[PDB]
């Protein structure tokens, strides 16, 4: 079933929830003080949504670095690879050029991140839902729901890579202005407008002599950035994606497998009116019997009420003297099963007042006029 919680103090829940998990909390909040009347609390927390503001960096490429050596007043010699989009050239000559260029993904620089969760709270007959974030607690009269923060493999300034079809890697270090071959992000096509070539910081070691024929020997890095990443893939954090929403300069999705957790704090105020707002399986009938005293300022009046309790042996509550949804007095009483006589002292009202015996929002059908104070 569902457990009960005597609200002797504020209830507080503090816990960590998996981003791809929902959470349900249900409890009967029973009256502190020696009464077992109770208000239902029902909380539903939905899966985490991830929203990121980004700058699109264009496509990352794989490729193969090739080195060709040529010997024959070098100037002007055109070589058949001068039509290569990325080539570097330094009697003999040496030529690096990039071949087998293939796109492997679209990359995006994170500007700002925001984790949301939808939260629904029912407290008694009140039900309210809100999408919350760390900068916006769920607030109601009796219940607060806060996200303290999230443990995340994503960060600001990080770069996200999407494999085709949109796989995914997190990079904490992405080349921006100067890219050397072998770096993450080394070969880029931003905007698709042009081709951004990497640099080759290595040196050419010209081996020169007779008969053996010369060889150009480049001593820099020969392995592309993409290959280096795949070769040490465990150094990088992968992610999977579901329920995507690619709005060009914003990406919102739900993480489908573990990965992130957040901290949830739930606080439920002790200050609760268990009358009016709460329930009791006890059924109470009220009727006015008689009245004495005066309306308005002075001695005041006393209303006698007949009060019936069923479905329990005793019930501690308050019986009130009210008129037209204004109350003028109340008496606390422990009722016994069957009929009870309760005298309630009150003050106030006017000549047109009909004072009824009342409990919560329920009042008897009969009410009485008190006498004039003159």
């Amino acid at each position, epitope marked *: 079933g569902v457990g009960s919680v005597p609200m002797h103090t504020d209830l507080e829940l503090d816990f960590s929830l998996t981003s791809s998990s929902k959470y349900t909390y249900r409890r009967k909040l029973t009256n502190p003080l020696e009464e077992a009347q109770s208000i239902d609390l029902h909380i539903e927390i939905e899966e985490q949504t991830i929203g990121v503001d980004v700058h699109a960096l264009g496509h990352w490429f794989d*490729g193969r670095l*090739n080195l060709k050596t*040529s*010997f*024959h007043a070098c100037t*002007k*010699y*055109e*070589y*058949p*690879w*001068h*039509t*290569a*989009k990325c080539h570097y050239e330094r009697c003999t000559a040496c030529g690096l*050029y*990039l*071949d*087998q*260029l*293939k*796109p492997v993904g679209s990359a995006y620089k994170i500007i700002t991140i925001r984790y949301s969760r939808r939260v629904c709270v029912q407290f008694g007959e009140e039900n309210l839902c809100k999408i919350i974030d760390m900068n916006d607690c769920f607030v109601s009269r009796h219940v607060k729901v806060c996200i303290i923060g999230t443990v995340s493999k994503f960060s600001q300034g990080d770069t996200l890579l999407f494999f085709g079809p949109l796989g995914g890697l997190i990079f904490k270090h992405w080349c921006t202005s100067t890219c050397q071959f072998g770096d993450p992000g080394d070969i880029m096509s931003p905007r*698709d407008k*042009g081709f951004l070539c990497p640099e080759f910081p290595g040196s050419f070691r010209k081996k020169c002599n007779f008969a053996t*024929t010369p060889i150009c020997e480049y001593d820099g890095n020969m392995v592309s950035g993409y290959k280096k990443v795949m070769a040490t893939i465990d150094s990088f954090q992968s992610f999977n994606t579901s329920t995507m929403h690619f709005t060009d300069e914003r990406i919102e999705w739900k993480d489908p497998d573990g990965m992130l957790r957040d901290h949830i704090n739930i606080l439920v105020t002790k200050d609760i009116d268990f009358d009016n707002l709460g329930e009791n399986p006890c059924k109470i009938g009220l009727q006015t019997s008689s009245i004495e005293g005066a309306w308005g300022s002075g001695v005041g009046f006393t209303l006698t009420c007949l009060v019936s309790l069923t479905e329990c042996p005793t019930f501690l509550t308050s019986i009130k003297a009210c008129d037209k949804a204004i109350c003028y007095g109340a008496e606390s009483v422990t009722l016994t099963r069957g009929q009870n006589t309760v005298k309630v002292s009150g003050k106030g009202g006017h000549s047109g007042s009909t004072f009824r015996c009342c409990h919560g929002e329920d009042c008897s059908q009969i009410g009485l006029h008190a006498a004039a104070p003159h």
Partner: antibody
Amino acid sequence: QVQLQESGPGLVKPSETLSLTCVVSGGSISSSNWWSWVRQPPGKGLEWIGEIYHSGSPNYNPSLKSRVTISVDKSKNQFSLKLSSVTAADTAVYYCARQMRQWGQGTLVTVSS
Amino acid sequence: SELTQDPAVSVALGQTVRITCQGDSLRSYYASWYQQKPGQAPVLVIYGKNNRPSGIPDRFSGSSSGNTASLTITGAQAEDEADYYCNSRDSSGNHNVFGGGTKLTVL
């Protein structure tokens, strides 16, 4: 400035070995780095045969390799081409080009019998 | 093939032409464009990224994106009625391949 002119035998019988000659005039053949052969059959498109950018070794088209031999000599100062065992599909206009910027006016070769 | 063109393209005088060439090596290499008139040797028009030889009009332009490369002719004139061949390096990096050619008719 130089002007290229390629010459051949015109008409040859099948299986007979073909031999083209591209003469460089107005300068040396070593003045330009890289020389190329390319032919086109009548009514058809261009087909790259081979090129010599390198004093070390020439590039050849896979489909035409072995059958085709290309050379560069400085004594006669001319670009050389030799096709072995010629069929009725080798009949085409053979072009000589340096750096693929400057072209000779070509020479027709027909293979019939 | 591995370097495909459209066989024939027809243009009315004054209009703008776009001749496209598509191949796997075209994203590793800049295409070369050659213009051939009937009974004449091929003539280089474009190489690299929009670099072009002297004697060639301003209306010839170079274009590349993905595995395609395009030769654009803005404000076409009658003398442009010729063959156009797309030329690039092979993916192996050892061959030079031509396209199927494109017969441009000006009206």
